[PDB]
């Protein structure tokens, strides 16, 4: 790895600089290098890893959606067929996206998840595993779409089981996991009723626990609660 000669602390320092510079491909490479040092990650470091790769894959997902839409339009009765280029370039972006997802899943499997024993770290990583299988599912078609969906579901479910046992219903890790699992149900798994039920129960149980929170924690929890509400408004 090209980051193998750099100090762990230097990699984290540069990841933060890259964040400030909006250089998210660099940020992701720095954080991959930090993970590959083999030590567990702190909360701040886990967040840097997530911010970096979410921004990278987010650009890829947006581009893939643009190209897929153009491709679908080109494949309609009455469209002047324009050769293989749209498909080729959509496939190029898709392969790069799948590569980023495989890289993140590889870091989780070797060996972030198995060394994560505290609930806050383990739930975070299992949610990430669900998320990156979900991004793979967004572009999957053939035989393996079913298996990718099941892998996402399994990771989210393990994370949910731990979060419900070990975290209060306002915990922002737990809330964002439930948010993303509800998105999985609506957008990937063709289960809008499950999505709505999960979003509603999550919201209501968090509402009832807000009285226990400080001002700052209340702001964190209610921000995610608003996203649950936004989706429920979209969905109903």
């Amino acid at each position: 790895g090209a980051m193998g000669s750099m100090e762990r602390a230097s990699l984290i320092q540069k990841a933060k600089l890259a964040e400030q510079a909006e250089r998210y491909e660099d940020m992701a490479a720095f954080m991959k290098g930090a993970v590959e040092k083999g030590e567990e990650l702190s909360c701040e470091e886990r967040n840097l890893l997530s911010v970096a790769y979410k921004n990278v894959v987010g650009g890829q997902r947006a581009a893939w959606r643009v190209l897929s839409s153009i491709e679908q339009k080109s494949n309609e009765e009455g469209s002047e067929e324009k050769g293989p280029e749209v498909r080729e370039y959509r496939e190029k972006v898709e392969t790069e996206l799948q590569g980023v997802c495989d890289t993140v899943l590889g870091l989780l499997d070797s060996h972030l998840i198995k060394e994560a024993g505290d609930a806050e770290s383990r739930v975070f990583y299992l949610k990430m595993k669900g998320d990156y299988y979900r991004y793979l599912a967004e572009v999957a078609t053939g035989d393996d779409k079913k298996r990718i969906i099941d892998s996402a579901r399994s990771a989210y479910q393990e994370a949910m089981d731990i979060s419900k046992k070990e975290m209060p219903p306002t915990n922002p890790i737990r809330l964002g996991l439930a948010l993303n699992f509800s998105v999985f149900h609506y957008e990937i798994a063709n289960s809008p009723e499950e999505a709505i039920s999960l979003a509603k129960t999550t919201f209501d149980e968090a509402m009832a626990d807000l009285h226990t929170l400080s001002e700052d924690s209340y702001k964190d929890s209610t921000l995610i609660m608003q996203l649950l509400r936004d989706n429920l408004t979209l969905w109903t």
């Binding site: 993303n180 998105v183 995610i224 996203l227 936004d230 979209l234």
Partner: peptide, 10 residues
């Protein structure tokens, strides 16, 4: 419009 997932938080 697509559903909203957890955003990044600096």
């Amino acid at each position: 419009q697509r559903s909203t997932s957890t955003p990044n938080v600096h």
